[PDB]
Design a protein around this nucleic acid. Structure first.
Length: 73
RNA sequence: CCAGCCUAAACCGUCCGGCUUGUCCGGGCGGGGUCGUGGGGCCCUCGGACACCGAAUCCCCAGCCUAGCCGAAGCUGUUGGGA
């Protein structure tokens, strides 16, 4: 089974990672304890919009950084 | 006997709800779409259109069913209880 976890559980990996576990761990512990949410296609898309979000934003501000980099220098 | 159609899905607007407010997930609605020479979506170009196509839907009517009316032409005698 696949899932997207919301807590760095010293068993699988840090949050966000989309790690595999058997139905049980995720059907009767990890889902109800909201430790991780179920991994449908829908959600994997939610992932990208977020990553890219700050990806470009960190590069974009970065760009603006160089602007001041030159005029201040 | 005759007959073919609408949709789910990619996408866009919108309202609302959620939440690690995202250039987003979902739910409702609308737009979009319905195919086997495969189709649809998205961008570009063509002119994109007055045109075509047209209901199993709707209104009017005929006809029609539910009571009915017109409807031609004969008399005499004879048997017989009675023609």
């Amino acid at each position: 089974m696949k899932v997207i976890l919301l807590e760095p559980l010293e068993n699988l990996g840090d949050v966000g990672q989309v790690v595999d576990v058997k139905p049980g761990y995720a059907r009767n512990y990890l889902l109800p304890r909201g430790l991780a949410v179920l991994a449908t296609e829908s959600n994997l898309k939610a992932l990208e919009a977020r990553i890219r979000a700050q990806a470009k934003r960190l590069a974009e501000r970065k760009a603006e950084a160089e602007r001041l980099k030159e005029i201040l220098e």
